[PDB]
Amino acid sequence: KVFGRCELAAAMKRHGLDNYRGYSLGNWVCAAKFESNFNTQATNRNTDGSTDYGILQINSRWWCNDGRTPGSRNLCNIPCSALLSSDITASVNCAKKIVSDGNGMNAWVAWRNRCKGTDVQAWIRGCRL
Ligand code: NA
């Protein structure tokens, strides 16, 4: 499922991401835009034989089982395909354990490179929230 900016903003707020670990909604929308283009089905092979899955491009090295990621961890205790659903519950709940682990949203390269230190409130501007 491909979300619009404000449609995902509202879905993410609905799932309790707004100021989760002090990260305002704009931060999550910005990350989602530059990670997946708001597409729950987005997959991208990483450098090391891992793959990134879903709206927040969660990585198989650490966070889920895709049955091809070397000597792998499943820290969110899901198959990576669960993250591609039109229902974003799995991606949101896993993202909460990622951002909580101590590095915050720096886990997302797109966030660190494109959202961090920018006017992230632009991302929810004109959105019914
Ligand atoms: Na894995």
From Swiss-Prot:
Disulfide bonds: C6-C127, C30-C115, C64-C80, C76-C94
Reaction it catalyzes: Hydrolysis of (1->4)-beta-linkages between N-acetylmuramic acid and N-acetyl-D-glucosamine residues in a peptidoglycan and between N-acetyl-D-glucosamine residues in chitodextrins
EC category: hydrolase
InterPro entries named in the record: Glyco_hydro_22 (IPR001916), Glyco_hydro_22_CS (IPR019799), Glyco_hydro_22_lys (IPR000974), Lysozyme-like_dom_sf (IPR023346)
Domain C-type lysozyme: 1-129
MF-aspect GO terms: beta-N-acetylglucosaminidase activity; identical protein binding; lysozyme activity
GO cellular component: cytoplasm; endoplasmic reticulum; extracellular space
Keywords (A to Z) from UniProt: Allergen, Antimicrobial, Bacteriolytic enzyme, Disulfide bond, Glycosidase, Hydrolase, Secreted, Signal
SMART domains: LYZ1 (SM00263)
Its job: Lysozymes have primarily a bacteriolytic function; those in tissues and body fluids are associated with the monocyte-macrophage system and enhance the activity of immunoagents. Has bacteriolytic activity against M.luteus.
Misc note: Lysozyme C is capable of both hydrolysis and transglycosylation; it also shows a slight esterase activity. It acts rapidly on both peptide-substituted and unsubstituted peptidoglycan, and slowly on chitin oligosaccharides.
Descriptive protein name: Lysozyme C
Annotated organism of origin: Gallus gallus (Chicken)
Phylogenetic placement of the source organism: Eukaryota, Metazoa, Chordata, Craniata, Vertebrata
Name of the encoding gene: LYZ
